[PDB]
């Protein structure tokens, strides 16, 4: 279960059978002609793939640096790349003969994505969510219910995401025979980190073809934000063997790396073993998980995908950080300049790509992965600003 020294399948024996079986299924369908035929079918007619590669003519000229292109994942049904992975695992679960999907959610984004896919494929969907978050996410909970899923509030412990995750796991161990556990990012034990990446590679593939069609050549840099790392891995992957192409991940710098109020796991964490994987985690002095922060919910995670740790190690990819203030600026800028309101997570990549573009020549090319639309963050922003 490995990406260099990272990855693994570090979980209690009770989770081994379900995992082992998932590995088998993924192997037989990973390349099954019929499976992919359907996967592409839904991705196309339901999700809206492909997404366009947009040239921010006005923004690039305002900076006077390199050319800036945006992979518009903000246009997929649902408003975020998360939908790619949801459809994939839900379809796989269906082929496995499962009838129920379960997942947990904090902000509610993964919850909704899962709910939609379940509805599309006609599966029962139970979503675990900390009672704390249930209160905070009025509209997302309603959205999930509208989609036919039933959100199960967990009140044990801190009544937050962590408590919901455990409820989900317990559930799966007992019902894995007919229930699939839908992980939302390239994290967790094998085979998730890699399965999720595979279901997101479409992004990179499309972008490659697209940039060649527009510029007749591969890009100089590819910038994507990194929470768990699934949208970044999805667009990076297809370019991993194209040495010319520079890959840059942007983690949440929150209120400054020098303030403990961030989530830069790769840019400040130590390797460790949590959530079933050996990767980088923002740890305590005693090997305990530290609290994290970020204005962008999807970036607020103490860990990171094993595959990113591996890319950082072998130095195939460079990881940086951007502050809440910077991301917030990019949020407004993209809105006023290109008429596209980005998700706060994406705004981080936009922000870094902007300053990075300024230090390059007018003939260079940067592709930024706009992972989602910012409709979901209006309240967050409207409040602070």
């Amino acid at each position: 279960m490995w990406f260099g020294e990272f990855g693994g399948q570090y979980v209690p024996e009770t989770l081994i059978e379900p995992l082992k079986e998932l590995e088998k299924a993924y192997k037989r369908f990973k390349d099954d002609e019929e499976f992919n035929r359907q996967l592409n079918y839904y991705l196309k007619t339901w999700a809206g793939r492909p997404t366009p590669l947009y040239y921010a003519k006005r923004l690039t000229e305002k900076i006077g640096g390199a050319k800036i292109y945006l992979k518009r994942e903000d246009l997929v049904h649902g408003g975020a790349h998360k939908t790619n992975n949801a459809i994939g695992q839900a379809l796989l679960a269906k082929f496995m003969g499962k009838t129920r999907l379960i997942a947990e959610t904090g902000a509610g984004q993964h919850g909704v994505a899962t709910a939609m896919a379940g509805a599309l494929l006609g599966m029962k969907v139970d979503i675990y969510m900390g009672a704390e978050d249930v209160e905070r996410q009025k509209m997302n909970v309603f959205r999930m219910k509208l989609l036919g899923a039933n959100v199960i509030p967990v009140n044990s412990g801190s009544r937050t995401l962590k408590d919901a995750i455990n409820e989900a796991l317990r559930d799966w161990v007992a019902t894995f025979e007919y229930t699939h556990y839908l992980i939302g990012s390239v994290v967790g034990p094998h085979p998730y980190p890699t399965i999720v990446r595979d279901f997101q590679s479409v992004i990179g593939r499309e972008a490659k073809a697209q940039i060649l069609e527009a510029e007749g050549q591969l890009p100089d840099v590819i910038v994507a934000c990194v929470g768990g790392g699934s949208n970044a891995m999805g667009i990076f992957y297809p370019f991993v063997n194209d040495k010319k192409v520079k890959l840059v991940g942007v983690e949440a710098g929150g209120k400054g790396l020098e303030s403990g109020k961030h989530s830069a796991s790769l840019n400040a964490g130590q390797v460790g073993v949590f959530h079933g994987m050996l990767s980088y985690f923002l740890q305590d002095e005693e090997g305990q998980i530290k609290p994290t922060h970020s204005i962008a919910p999807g970036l607020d995670y103490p860990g990171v995908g094993p595959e990113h740790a591996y890319l950082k190690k072998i130095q195939r990819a460079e990881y940086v950080t951007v502050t809440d203030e910077e991301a917030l600026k990019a949020f407004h800028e993209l809105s006023r300049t290109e008429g596209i309101i980005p998700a706060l997570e994406s705004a981080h990549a936009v922000a870094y790509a902007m300053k990075l573009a300024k230090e390059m020549s007018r003939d260079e090319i940067i592709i930024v992965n706009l992972s989602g639309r910012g409709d979901k963050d209006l309240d967050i922003v409207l409040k602070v600003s």
């Binding site: 024996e13 989770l15 059978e17 455990n166 317990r170 949590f274 090997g287 998980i289």
Partner: protein, 241 residues
């Protein structure tokens, strides 16, 4: 690594404080054939609500890894009852397999169980464990195939720990025990969530070499805090009859 028919208590080190844990150990010692001591982790995985909460308590009160070894070492000044350390891989990884196992042995620890370290990934661990004089404890669940069961037994030098998928003991749990006895060479301890005398009796009757009691106890430690000592004995007493 414990006498047959033994009752094995489980406690989370540092819940509510390092001293109280030592006290609870000493108070229960006489009724136990072996003791399982858990090292607090920030992210337990499907560990079960009652136990899961004890971890949070312990860490909230500022628990620290050395305090675990201290409890074991201090306990050793009075008893020799087998002590099995239960922890997640991170702490031992962060410190060095051999280094951790060494300090454990030196503190008076007899066996260890790494909760989130798959059997097929513990080859090197079981190896250094032997060389450091620490017995290995691996667990198996109802969904564990007879195939892995054998492999688990083949790597266990302490005893196989059977646990249930989720207070009538599930039919599924007895089936695990049945197969286990019929397949393992090692002694088998069961943690099926015993809460009443009938469980202990029925389980031993079915071939359980040992019966673990954790939830029933930590639940009390959660309700009585530092003043749990007496209530713990009363409960243990009930379970042994």
């Amino acid at each position: 690594m414990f006498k047959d028919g033994s009752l094995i208590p489980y406690l989370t080190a540092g819940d509510p404080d390092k001293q109280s844990t030592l006290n609870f150990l000493l108070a229960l010692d006489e009724y136990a054939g072996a003791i399982e001591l858990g090292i607090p982790f920030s992210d337990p995985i499907a560990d079960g609500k009652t136990i899961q909460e004890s971890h949070y308590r312990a860490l909230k009160n500022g628990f620290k890894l050395r305090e675990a070894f201290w409890i074991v070492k201090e306990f050793r000044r009075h008893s020799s009852t087998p002590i099995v350390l239960m922890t997640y891989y991170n702490p031992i990884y962060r410190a060095g397999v051999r280094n951790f196992l060494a300090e454990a042995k030196a503190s008076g620890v007899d066996g260890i169980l790494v909760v989130d370290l798959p059997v097929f990934h513990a080859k090197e661990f079981t190896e250094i464990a032997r060389e450091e004089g620490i017995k290995t404890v691996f667990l198996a669940a109802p969904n564990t195939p007879d195939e892995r069961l054998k492999v688990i037994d083949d790597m266990t030098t302490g005893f196989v720990y059977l646990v249930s998928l989720y207070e009538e003991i599930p039919k599924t749990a007895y089936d695990l025990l049945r197969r286990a006895k019929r397949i393992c060479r090692n002694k088998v301890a069961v943690g099926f969530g015993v809460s009443k005398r009938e469980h202990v009796v029925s389980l031993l009757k079915e071939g359980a070499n040992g019966v673990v009691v954790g939830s029933a106890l930590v639940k009390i430690i959660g309700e009585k805090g530092r003043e749990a000592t007496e209530f713990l004995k009363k409960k243990v007493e009930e379970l042994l009859g």
